[PDB]
Amino acid sequence: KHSLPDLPYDYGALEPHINAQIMQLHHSKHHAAYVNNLNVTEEKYQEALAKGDVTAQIALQPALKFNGGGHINHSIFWTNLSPNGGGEPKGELLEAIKRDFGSFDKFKEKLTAASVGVQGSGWGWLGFNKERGHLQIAACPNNDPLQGTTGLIPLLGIDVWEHAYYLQYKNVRPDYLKAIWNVINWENVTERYMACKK
Amino acid sequence: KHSLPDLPYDYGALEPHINAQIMQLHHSKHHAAYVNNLNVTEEKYQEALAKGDVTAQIALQPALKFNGGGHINHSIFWTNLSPNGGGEPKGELLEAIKRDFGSFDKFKEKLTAASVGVQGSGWGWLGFNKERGHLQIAACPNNDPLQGTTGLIPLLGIDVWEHAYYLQYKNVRPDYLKAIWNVINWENVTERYMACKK
Amino acid sequence: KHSLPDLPYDYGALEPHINAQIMQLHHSKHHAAYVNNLNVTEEKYQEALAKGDVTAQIALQPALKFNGGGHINHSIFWTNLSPNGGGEPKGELLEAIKRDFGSFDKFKEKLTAASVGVQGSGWGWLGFNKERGHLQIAACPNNDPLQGTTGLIPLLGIDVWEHAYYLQYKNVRPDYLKAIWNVINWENVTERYMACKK
């Protein structure tokens, strides 16, 4: 009942920033596996929930969280990126980024440190904190969802697992961070932003 | 659909080892709350599973694990204890405890260190490892189930949370450990033991 | 070498809100055991350091964070309480509380909710975020120290480990929280706010 979403562009669309080969492996291989493992795990859960088996239920948690998170995370990732993307946002979003981080440049600097800060697998996030309406920068381990574990609403996420860049950038996570700013689809981030204050 | 099990004895049955007041609070107040919170959490999960909401699903995990675990753990605890209990086991179980820990006395010494070892809330367990048929001593945090998180089959569990003893023994966890050995219902542990090798 | 700080008042000074039996036991047993094991773990860590033992250094971490955090946590705690009033804070801090949590009463209940939501052993805090420049509430497991694990400088803490209230309020953590506002030393909390000077 969960399906692999189609990329809103081609594998070679985010070039030269994101290599077309990484884009296919990432979408067709990695993301494909999460959706698949989520469906069996979710299905298995209904059988455990159905019998009242609390042991099977609790046992299936790491799998549900990891595959569930991977599906959530990557669905949002593709939409945050675009061949038509780049630069900086406008209107509401741009006024808020300024107001909260100092300037647009200070925001990037903070989202980059949070993304490189991750030790092991993980993600960097620009989210929205509902209690006291403000933007926030958070880092998540492995495939842990941003909203599912912190409550923040995901606006812009930066996959910082080694599979998201190693083929092209190798061990230099900072260079991957630098390049990626060019493909950020802000009208996507903006759309996500307007739906939070309402 | 989950209900609070009835104690196989009275609140004042495990005296003087376990105070009758602790027994009532523990059963009627603490255990009562887990069963109750588990039912709403499980019920809430079916609604999230029903809509395919992975975020609600992952969000409800800490609650399901804690209340689920608390119900599992305490159900097993009451049965491990008895007013007719005490001493040491016999037959199969006694030969295995000897074989695996050195002697019965070395086993107690190890289960005690594992129970006092817990820093914060937790449990001490004598379990059974299916892969390579042997008894094992494990410690679990908060209300994390033994089988649900480690795979071991629970035989004898020792609640080491402060609510399981503070009124009677105060901060002296070691004295509570010493006293409890007198109320262990081994025929219960034995029954649990025979069902593992078959 | 680390030392146990004498209570800033008498054991039974916080009654009827916090019993003398509780304070006595909490300070001279629990806290007393934290500073000792902290000193031992610290002694053991400097020998592992002189030696190139990275294995021994990592093995000590859990004892160091628990006991080291236990002493940090409990030290501030005593200074957060006082025989002399609870009520409301004045000046700068009170304003900040309103600027961030809407009002004092709304702050009051968001911290109560955080303290009550702690599953297992832990603490509830009011801290100061120096990188955002505002106040914020947080929860910490077992004795994990606020500043060393979150960067948030602690102003007011509330121990929700069962040994902090059980002898008096039993399982009713919500009643222990109502009564502790009557003894919160807001003079201390205000000094701690103007410590990360504004």
Added chain:
Amino acid sequence: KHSLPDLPYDYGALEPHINAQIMQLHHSKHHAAYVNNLNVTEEKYQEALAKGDVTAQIALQPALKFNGGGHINHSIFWTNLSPNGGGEPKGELLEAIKRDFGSFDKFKEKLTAASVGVQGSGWGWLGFNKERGHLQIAACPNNDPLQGTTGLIPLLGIDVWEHAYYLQYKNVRPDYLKAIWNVINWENVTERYMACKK
């Protein structure tokens, strides 16, 4: 001060099983960065120690366990691999493997399953349990060192972080595992077994 150990063989010595581009990058970039940050974190920890700073000591833990574990983990790793054969081990170790995992091939696959089941970054191990007196398999997250976090003395380790196989095997972790048995230095693994002398 800690130092980078030279590979016991040439960068391209493990081909076609493990490429030279991978080994080069893995040793001179990743490992090289671990020993440095380990030395810095260690320098910073002795100043926090001289001072009575328990807050700073706890803040350093994550950098110390990751980098300190990274160096421990990667050091043993190089000595687990060799241009000279994989195949089967002889004598005592081989017997023990059979006594505990049934057979060599059955051990082979239980460690593969452990290495493949790692969600995110981590390692798969074959260790020796000194308190039970037998061999056992384990999995460790990120760079958490086996002995410092489990007490199990490491004999054979398998890095399953994506930077260990991606450039060559891509997403197919199961293929990287098949090929690594061809380069396992069983002479080293046997010395490590007779190190915790039997």
